[PDB]
Design a protein around this ligand. Structure first.
Ligand code: CHL
Ligand code: CHL
Ligand code: CLA
Ligand code: CLA
Ligand code: CLA
Ligand code: CLA
Ligand code: CLA
Ligand SMILES: CCCCCCCCCCCCCCCC(=O)OC[C@H](COP(=O)(O)OC[C@@H](O)CO)OC(=O)CCCCCCCCCCCCCCC
Ligand SMILES: CC(/C=C/C=C(C)/C=C/[C@@]12O[C@]1(C)C[C@@H](O)CC2(C)C)=C\C=C\C=C(C)\C=C\C=C(C)\C=C\[C@@]12O[C@]1(C)C[C@@H](O)CC2(C)C
Ligand SMILES: CC1=C[C@H](O)CC(C)(C)[C@H]1/C=C/C(C)=C/C=C/C(C)=C/C=C/C=C(C)/C=C/C=C(C)/C=C/C1=C(C)C[C@H](O)CC1(C)C
Ligand SMILES: CC1=C(C/C=C(\C)CCC[C@H](C)CCC[C@H](C)CCCC(C)C)C(=O)c2ccccc2C1=O
Ligand code: SF4
Lengths: 742, 42, 222, 203
């Protein structure tokens, strides 16, 4: 059945191994042969799979390790709440959120660096933040420095709880294997307990605290006089003075007269004109609706009583003619291998983060988030990068599974077999498309640029010339605009304001949203994204399929997951290891994402954001030039890189100086990485030797013999810096630009 | 007790302790003799 | 051996030798296959009897002071429903010889001596009658059963004088009473949230008017 | 072995065996797990036992006697700020030298027992103590009182540590009380005597 059998004191808490570096691995433990040793110490620190050969210990280590990862997050949260309480103009920000920048960092004045303390207003100074906590603390009705302090302590305590918990469950009472593999109950609790009861509890706090309090601040009152949140929960008559449905108590909920709670549980849609965010009634309803759906879904898989499904039997009924044995056997290979689960989870959590970034800019959920141009740009950019990386990780661990855990004599699967057998078709067809999109997406930009350069602006691809109208997006925009009429009679308005119809929402002389048009200039760039996404898929997919064998090397599996090459024979076999396919994917992931966050930044400044006249005419930040200048490659140079880098470049001598330095500093690191990617090891090894000789002359030759980095480390350092230089350069480019213009 | 001291003697832990002390010292001197473009004693 | 809502798992280990047994256990807890901490069938039994005993004096104090305020010679000042005695300030309080939070720490220290020593005898039988404790060591060794230490300080006259059946009969009475009190205290609470007029009053509300039946009403007030 | 333990019924650590005066088997973190650190730490606890004993005498006795009207001593808390016959700095400097002399020689005895006990000037002034940390001699035992049988010194030394531990808590008592209460230690005693159940940390 399903029970809790654990062990007692597997590994004794002691400090011995803390003074025996490289104890975990048998190879590393003998000592530092050369400096190659101190690099292999960290490269194999967390690879629990290579230390031991059984699933039980690997499990207990990953289970306890997560507790550490969970603990750090709490400590990270604790600082953010603490800092917002002791070093912020939050309470001032609650008075005029429209035109006082959120600041929650203050620097010590040592070497003149107090120039960084910007005049964010509100009688305060400091680094203007952009993570947008302030809109999060207002949407939860905090309205006090004291309440930000107590949660900071509460957040800190849990960190000690988690960190303690990690210790307890690896040294004192560690679970057994049978505990881990019972994945029906695993899903059963997470769906009902974590996901389900998480929302319902939160839908609680919104009903009794965030809603009635924020309804005071939105109504307009000084924060200091809002009765404390435990007054409503005690004095039930106060909730009556706003929400008369709270007189009858919770009995309508029990008599199915649910249309009595219509005051604070609605289906409005749209955005709030006062605060530019969603209607907290909808949000209040939303988590409640989600709560029920998850909770019921929790009760599906059989755990201990008669009722419930069997995850094994579900996978063993779907087998088709084209597919053969179908999903039989996938239960094992998804249960006796952590690298399978980590690869599968990474892709979904990777994808979801992206969808988060597409929704949070079009349905602004927190109050006074819409007119916070510094926040919108950062939050959209941040989760794109997070979403991009995690997807690449799903390729690496899927590739690792093919090399280490896959075995067609015991863990045999049929679908994963058929997929292997026709892999030549899969890559070649994906190869042709990546070429097709390559010619018809970039080429149109090149042809546009050539014709424009020759004085033929009537042969370019644009709205004023040969036209390419996205109709399919223009059609679906139409449908969502008229959905409130027929196909969703409950809704008062559309689910957003970017649908091809409606009206803008103005908050304090700053546009929240308005219908986003889709002309030709948008059609091209959407087919750029379809191109770089496909190419990135090609590299990672090729790595996963060919991680065990190919027509070049027939025994690549025997060489492991990350090996440099197989020598210069057969024409040259540099970079055939699956690790080097993900190594290549990173650049395209860095390429796909970068154009997306360029596309978002220009489209919103040119077509959406911007001030609004008192009369009613709207003037966007860049004057609406995206629809004409974004179709020529030179256009992306003049009017985006050259014209929107002005603020970062001349940011010297004012609080935005720290961005001016990072802008340069990130170039230096980017250009630095090239030394590792372009060159090779055998040159650096020899130059090291001559340097080593001079130290022999003066007797200062070390005993950990100097060595050059290993082949796959020269690449690993090469890509890491390149990514760090590329991402940070955009970081300093964006924040300094948007903070100055809005 | 011996094992704790040995661990505290491994290279990375000394580095942060050593450099941290060095950072504190330089910051203090710049707090007391700031701008310091020349050495005007002799 | 009367069984209530038994289960195949339950009757593999609930042998009935433990007093208060009725073979009711559908959540895998007392299962002896899985024993880390706090899932030992002894410890759970140890926590079962203690919680009951705390309930057996917790319940009576949860209805004594107001009901004794119904006729008794208690001056009405210290005759109050239990939740307004001072435990829950938002329900009310009363000014005792102290001011609160000094009563707490005093209480937590006095409890600390009895509690921790009460814990050690579970870890190390007979230990608490070895180190000097101002005399009294002759008793604090216990009889070897942590839940039933015995001794002239704990079992002064001595019942269960000599009869295991009686003791088994007695301990059966001790748990079923314990279960009765735990549920009862859970009654005095959930009544308070909904009724909000005090425990013993809420029995009169159903006495003078059985048609009250606050279930159907479900009005909430402090 | 069967000596009283801080936590009765617990198993004391092996390196604590009751030999040393004041060994109630208390070392949860094992700071004295290895013999050498124990040896040094024994000294550390010993001297800390003597300083606070004077400090407890230094704080409580004058504040007591000034609370009643017999004298004029101010608060120990602001005792440093007061201006005496010269600047504080030089007196501290003078304190640096002279203490460094004893804290120098004491240091030599610690690292090398028995090599410091003879007077550098008048060599017939040799000190009599044999145990590290117990100098003996006519300066520090004007009548002996340390040269006795065991089970008496062990009693006496335990009467020296057990008081010292009582001091170190008390002076840190006078420390934190002066910070979050506004008055001297004796007031914190009396205001706790008028309403013991009300006037505490919880104001
Ligand atoms: C100085 C360090 C020291 C500390 C932090 C403690 C604290 C403790 N003693 Mg302890 N003792 C200490 C030293 C000593 N004790 C004792 C004599 C006792 C006795 C007799 C008892 C304790 C008990 C306790 C425990 C319960 C106290 C409590 O409930 O708090 C609120 C706790 C571990 C109680 C205990 O351990 O019960 C299991 C208990 O009965 N102590 C002696 C003299 C022998 C000590 C000498 O240093
Ligand atoms: C040991 C020792 C201890 C525990 C103290 C403690 C103190 N001294 Mg003191 N001193 C000590 C040695 C010495 N002091 C001084 C000279 C001074 C001065 C001039 C001052 C102090 C002050 C202080 C106070 C600082 C307040 C604080 O710590 O905020 C937490 C505190 C009561 C300050 C004070 O009195 O503020 C009220 C102060 O101005 N001390 C000398 C040189 C003679 C010492 C030699 O050992
Ligand atoms: C929470 C997600 C997660 C988890 C648990 C892991 C866990 C692991 N990864 Mg992995 N990975 C992830 C996300 C994750 N990764 C993502 C998002 C990517 C894409 C960038 C990768 C790319 C990746 C590669 C390419 C490799 C691993 C490897 C490993 C294993 C060894 C890691 C190690 O020793 O590094 C120790 C930690 C460091 C060296 C710190 C680096 C400092 C950075 C650069 C700053 C370990 C099981 C290795 C492996 O299993 O080989 C068998 C391996 O080769 N991962
Ligand atoms: C600016 C630099 C650059 C360019 C142009 C390319 C171009 C290409 N790379 Mg690539 N790559 C680069 C940098 C670049 N890479 C870097 C730095 C890396 C390291 C990370 C990689 C890593 C990499 C990998 C790993 C892969 C590619 C792939 C591809 C090809 C897919 C795109 C395609 O088919 O479009 C078609 C070609 C173009 C759009 C180029 C412009 C052509 C224009 C439209 C017209 C050209 C003139 C015309 C022919 C007239 C001829 C004139 C006559 C006189 C001759 C393409 C050839 C993928 C591939 O080949 O598989 C599909 C692939 O798997 N590259
Ligand atoms: C296929 C597209 C589509 C989608 C996504 C929705 C989506 C929704 N419909 Mg819907 N609906 C559709 C087509 C669709 N409808 C069509 C073609 C009809 C026939 C006229 C309806 C008739 C309909 C009714 C009658 C109702 C909904 C309702 C709803 C909501 C529940 C949800 C927003 C309900 C609603 O108003 O939700 C608030 C509701 O009462 N729908
Ligand atoms: C992350 C979720 C999680 C999960 C799945 C478990 C799971 C379990 N815990 Mg546990 N535990 C957790 C968090 C968790 N714990 C935390 C955060 C703490 C610190 C408060 C503890 C403290 C704790 C104790 C003190 C005990 C357990 C016990 C148990 C087991 C019953 C079971 C294996 C009990 C057991 O039988 O030991 C394994 C037990 O004695 N856990
Ligand atoms: C563990 C059980 C428990 C707990 C926590 C309490 C708690 C309390 N009782 Mg109580 N009580 C209990 C059992 C309990 N009672 C039982 C079983 C009886 C019947 C024998 C009583 C009879 C009783 C009376 C008659 C009074 C209290 C009172 C009180 C309050 C002051 C403390 C006290 O008694 O002063 C110690 C009293 C001494 C005489 C000594 C406090 C809320 C007083 C009060 O105001 O009621 C709220 C009060 O006058 N109790
Ligand atoms: C046009 C091709 C339609 C493709 C289509 O509709 O597939 C449908 C086809 C259905 O397979 P079965 O019905 O035999 O599989 C039943 C499933 O439950 C798994 O057994 O899937 C395939 O055979 C793989 C084809 C992938 C082709 C991917 C192209 C991109
Ligand atoms: C409390 C203290 C040290 C306490 C140490 C503790 C608890 C450690 C406990 C543990 O390690 C063990 C035991 C075992 C581990 O396994 C467990 C833990 C728990 C980790 C030192 C105080 C030590 C206190 C001292 C030394 C006090 C000295 C007083 C002095 C010097 C005099 C000061 C004055 O001169 C001024 C300043 C001003 C004048 O006006 C007034 C006077 C008073 C005259
Ligand atoms: C068995 C099983 C098995 C399966 O498998 C599953 C399931 C079924 C789930 C399970 C079940 C379980 C259960 C039911 C349990 C319960 C318990 C309880 C209730 C306890 C209480 C318990 C309770 C208790 C102790 C209580 C106590 C109390 C007290 C002291 C009181 C006190 C007081 C008073 C007087 C007055 C003042 O002024 C206040 C106060 C202070 C407040
Ligand atoms: C530059 C370069 C090197 C040389 C880089 C080396 C040898 C490592 C860089 C030196 C590091 C920083 C060691 C210095 C840190 C030591 C621990 C000493 C610390 C002392 C400091 C506190 C001063 C390679 O080894 C290499 C290998 C493969 C492909 C490309 C390259 C490559 O491009
Ligand atoms: S160049 Fe390097 S990677 Fe390529 S074959 Fe030679 S050794 Fe291998």
């Amino acid at each position: 059945e399903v029970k809790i059998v654990v062990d007692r004191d597997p590994v004794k808490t002691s400090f011995e191994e803390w003074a025996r570096p490289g104890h975990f691995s048998r190879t590393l433990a003998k000592g530092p042969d050369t400096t190659t040793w101190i690099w292999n110490l960290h490269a194999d620190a967390h690879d629990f799979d290579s230390h031991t050969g059984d699933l039980e210990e690997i499990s207990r280590k990953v289970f306890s390790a997560h507790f550490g990862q969970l603990s750090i997050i709490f400590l990270w949260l604790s600082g953010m709440y603490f800092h917002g309480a002791r070093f912020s103009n939050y309470e001032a920000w609650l008075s005029d959120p429209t035109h006082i920048g959120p600041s929650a960092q203050v620097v010590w004045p040592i070497v003149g660096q107090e120039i960084l303390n910007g005049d964010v207003g509100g009688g305060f100074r400091g680094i203007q933040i952009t993570s947008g906590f302030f809109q999060l603390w207002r949407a939860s009705g905090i309205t006090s420095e004291l309440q930000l302090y107590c949660t900071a302590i509460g957040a800190l305590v849990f960190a000690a709880l988690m960190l303690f918990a990690g210790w307890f469950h690896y040294h004192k009472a560690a679970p057994k294997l049978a505990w881990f593999q019972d994945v029906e109950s695993m899903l059963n609790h997470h769906l009902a307990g974590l996901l389900g009861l998480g929302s319902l509890s939160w839908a609680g706090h919104q009903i009794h605290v965030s809603l009635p309090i924020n309804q005071f601040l939105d109504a307009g009152v000084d924060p200091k006089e809002i009765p404390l949140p435990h007054e409503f929960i005690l004095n039930r008559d106060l909730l009556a003075q706003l929400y008369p449905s709270f007189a009858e108590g919770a009995t309508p909920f029990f008599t199915l007269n649910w249309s009595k709670y219509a005051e604070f549980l609605t289906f409005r849609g749209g955005l709030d004109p006062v605060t530019g965010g969603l209607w907290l009634t909808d949000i209040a309803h939303h988590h409640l609706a989600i709560a029920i759906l998850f909770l019921i879904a929790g009760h599906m898989y059989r755990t201990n009583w008669g009722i419930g499904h069997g995850l094994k039997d579900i996978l063993e009924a779907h087998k088709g003619p084209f597919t053969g044995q179908g999903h039989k056997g996938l239960y094992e290979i998804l249960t006796t291998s952590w690298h399978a689960q980590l690869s599968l989870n990474l892709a979904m959590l990777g994808s979801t983060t992206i969808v988060v970034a597409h929704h949070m800019y079009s349905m602004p959920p927190y109050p006074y988030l819409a007119t916070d141009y510094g926040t919108q740009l950062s939050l959209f950019t941040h989760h794109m990068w997070i979403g991009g990386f995690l997807i690449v990780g799903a390729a690496a661990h899927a590739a690792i599974f093919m090399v280490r855990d896959y075995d067609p004599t015991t863990r045999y699967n049929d679908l994963l077999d058929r997929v292997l057998r026709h892999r030549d078709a899969i890559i070649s067809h994906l190869n042709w498309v990546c070429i097709f999109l390559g010619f018809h997406s970039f080429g149109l930009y090149i042809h546009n640029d050539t014709m424009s350069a020759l004085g033929r602006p009537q042969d370019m691809f644009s709205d004023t010339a040969i036209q390419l109208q996205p109709i399919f997006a223009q059609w679906v925009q139409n449908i969502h605009a008229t959905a409130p009429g027929v196909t969703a009679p409950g809704a008062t308005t559309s689910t957003s304001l970017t649908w091809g119809g409606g009206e803008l929402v103005a908050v304090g002389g700053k546009v929240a949203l308005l219908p986003i048009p889709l002309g030709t200039a948008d059609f091209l760039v959407h087919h750029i994204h379809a191109f770089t996404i496909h190419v990135t898929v090609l590299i990672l997919l090729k790595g996963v399929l060919f991680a065990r064998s190919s027509r070049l090397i027939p025994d690549k599996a025997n060489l492991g997951f990350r090996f440099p090459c197989d020598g210069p024979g057969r024409g040259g076999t540099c970079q055939v290891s699956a690790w080097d396919h993900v190594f290549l994917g990173l650049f395209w992931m860095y390429n796909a994402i970068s154009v997306v966050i360029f596309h978002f930044s220009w489209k919103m400044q040119s077509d959406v954001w911007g001030t609004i006249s008192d009369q009613g005419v709207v003037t966007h930040i860049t004057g609406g030039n995206f629809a004409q200048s974004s179709i020529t490659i030179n256009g992306w140079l003049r009017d985006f890189l050259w014209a929107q880098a002005s603020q970062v470049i001349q940011s010297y001598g004012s609080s935005l100086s720290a961005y001016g330095l990072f802008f340069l500093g990130a170039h230096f690191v980017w250009a630095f990485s090239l030394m590792f990617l372009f060159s090779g090891r055998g040159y650096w090894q020899e130059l090291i030797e001559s340097i080593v000789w001079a130290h022999n002359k003066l007797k200062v030759a070390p005993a950990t013999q100097p060595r050059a980095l290993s082949i796959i480390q020269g690449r690993a350092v090469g890509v890491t810096h390149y990514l760090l230089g590329g991402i940070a350069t955009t970081w300093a480019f964006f924040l300094a630009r948007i903070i100055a213009v809005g | 007790m011996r094992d704790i001291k040995t661990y505290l003697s491994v290279a990375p832990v000394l580095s942060t302790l050593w450099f941290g002390a060095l950072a504190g010292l330089l910051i203090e001197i710049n707090r007391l003799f700031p701008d310091a473009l020349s050495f005007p004693f002799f | 051996r009367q069984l209530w809502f038994a289960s195949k798992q339950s009757l593999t280990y609930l042998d009935g030798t433990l007093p208060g047994d009725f073979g009711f256990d559908p959540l895998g807890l007392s299962d002896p296959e899985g024993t880390g901490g706090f899932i030992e069938p002894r410890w759970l039994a140890y926590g079962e009897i203690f919680n009951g005993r705390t309930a057996m004096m917790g319940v009576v104090g949860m209805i004594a002071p107001e009901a004794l305020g119904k006729v008794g010679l208690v001056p009405p000042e210290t005759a109050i429903p239990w939740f307004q005695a001072g435990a829950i300030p938002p329900a009310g309080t009363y000014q005792y010889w102290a001011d609160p939070y000094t009563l707490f720490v005093f209480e937590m220290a006095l409890i600390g001596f009895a509690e921790h020593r009460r814990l050690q005898d579970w870890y190390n039988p007979g230990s608490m009658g070895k180190q000097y404790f101002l005399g009294l060591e002759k008793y604090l060794g216990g009889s070897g059963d942590p839940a039933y230490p015995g001794g002239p300080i704990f079992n002064p006259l001595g019942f269960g004088t000599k009869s295991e059946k009686e003791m088994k009969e007695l301990k059966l009475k001790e748990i079923k009473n314990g279960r009765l009190a735990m549920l009862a205290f859970l009654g005095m609470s959930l009544q308070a949230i909904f009724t909000g007029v005090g425990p013993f009053q809420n029995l009169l509300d159903h006495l003078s008017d059985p048609v009250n039946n606050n279930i159907l009403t479900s009005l909430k007030f402090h | 072995p069967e000596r009283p333990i801080w936590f009765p019924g617990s198993t004391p650590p092996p390196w604590l065996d009751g030999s040393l005066p004041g060994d109630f088997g208390f070392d949860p973190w094992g700071l004295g797990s290895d013999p050498e650190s124990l040896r040094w730490n024994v000294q550390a606890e010993l001297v800390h036992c003597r300083w606070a004993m004077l400090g407890a005498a230094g704080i409580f006795i004058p504040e007591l006697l000034t609370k009643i009207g017999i004298l004029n001593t101010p608060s120990w808390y602001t005792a440093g700020e007061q201006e005496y016959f010269t600047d504080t700095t030089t007196l501290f400097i003078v304190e640096l030298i002279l203490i460094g002399w004893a804290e120098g020689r004491r240091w030599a005895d610690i690292i090398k027992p028995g090599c410091v006990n003879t007077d550098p000037i008048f060599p017939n002034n040799k000190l009599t103590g044999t145990d590290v940390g117990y100098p003996g001699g006519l300066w520090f035992d004007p009548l002996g009182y340390g040269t006795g049988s065991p089970e008496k010194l062990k009693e006496l030394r335990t009467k020296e540590i057990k008081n010292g531990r009582l001091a170190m808590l008390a002076v840190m008592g006078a420390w934190f009380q002066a910070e979050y209460t506004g008055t001297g230690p004796i007031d914190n005693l009396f205001a706790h005597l008028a309403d013991p159940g009300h006037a505490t940390i919880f104001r």
